[PDB]
From a paper:
Here we studied metal-preference evolution within the natural diversity of the iron/manganese superoxide dismutase (SodFM) family of reactive oxygen species scavengers. Only a few metalloenzymes have been rigorously demonstrated to be cambialistic in vivo, including some iron (Fe)- or manganese (Mn)-dependent superoxide dismutases (SODs; SodFMs); metalloenzymes that play an important role in cellular reactive oxygen species defence. To study this process, we leveraged the existence of naturally Fe-specific, Mn-specific and flexible Fe/Mn-cambialistic SodFM homologues, which differentially utilize these metals to catalyse the detoxification of superoxide. By combining phylogenetics, biochemistry and structural biology, we demonstrate that SodFM metal utilization can be evolutionarily fine tuned by sliding along a scale between perfect manganese and iron specificities.
Residue numbers in the entry:
A (entry chain A), B (entry chain B): 2 to 203
The structure:
Amino acid sequence: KHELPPLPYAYNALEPFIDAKTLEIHHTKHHQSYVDKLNAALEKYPDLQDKTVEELIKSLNELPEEIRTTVRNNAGGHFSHTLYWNIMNPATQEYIPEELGNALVETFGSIIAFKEQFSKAAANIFGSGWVWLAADANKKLKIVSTTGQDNPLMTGDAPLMGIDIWEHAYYLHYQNRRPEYIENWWNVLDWKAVEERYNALG
Amino acid sequence: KHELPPLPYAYNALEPFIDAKTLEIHHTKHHQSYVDKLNAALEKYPDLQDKTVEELIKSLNELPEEIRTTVRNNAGGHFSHTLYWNIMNPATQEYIPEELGNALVETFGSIIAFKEQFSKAAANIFGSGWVWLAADANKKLKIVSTTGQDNPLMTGDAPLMGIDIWEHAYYLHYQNRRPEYIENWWNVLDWKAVEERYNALG
Ligand SMILES: [Mn+2]
Ligand SMILES: [Mn+2]
């Protein structure tokens, strides 16, 4: 009963920053698999089908042991990819909303300093994982590195943006040149969507 | 002082099972990086510069905390890739030497049962990792799954063979179709090399 949403844009809409073939496989193979695996697990325990993926992630320890790992990885995967697609947009004029821009400046010193810290954390991921910008219960911002499809919901924070550092996110166009992928990704980040998330925390 | 070993074969020698471009990048970029990073980690510790990769892995808990993780990952990476190249060869008629064949049959029931259990473990890796055939001190065999560049040396076992399940190992030719890469990899496995290692355990 969870469904894979259509992308908010065509599979070739993030060219040349992300290649169409990748965006299509990433969505229709990798993300689809997380949804299908999550659904298979939840079909065994159908009262969980009524939970949001966020509720599942935040209550892993309460789920049946049989499916706990499958749910961590696949709800985590579903959540994380959903956010990734929704914070990207066909390459658009740089405009960082005031509230978010000011908070980044206050926290990291400048926008450039934030981008540098974030880029460096992403370049330093070992194996498969993610780098996030997250806000804690009091809206303080941090950069978080995670493994697998783990995400900041698990540590009680609100993810605002994340970059996928799994090799499938970049290998077809960039191969081992992960820094090139990271640098290019900034061109499709939708600051307005990141701002919407931050703003909602009120 | 740690050096990248040459491949025992041409970059196109495992075609069509492993693509030349992959073998070239996998070796000259990924494996090279593990060597360069291990060397960089050891630069400040001339006493450690004399240790084998194997000695480093077997002693990680005794290494300086400053470098421990980097040594685990990069010594592990150097060890793991060295073994991977050396247990592959241009595809030839499958001949499994008697001693190893017999041990596989005694342990798993049949060669095909072993190949099934091994392939299943490889298909089930979440994120970046390896699957190994390993022997204990008594030449008892087991299949081991690891994360990152971890390897059976770390649990006091002798790795005989391992398949790289990091996405960089297969994404250019197979993309998300990891099972296709796994199935194909059997065609380039050098059972003579695996048997050499097993035989050495005496
Ligand atoms: Mn992904
Ligand atoms: Mn590798």
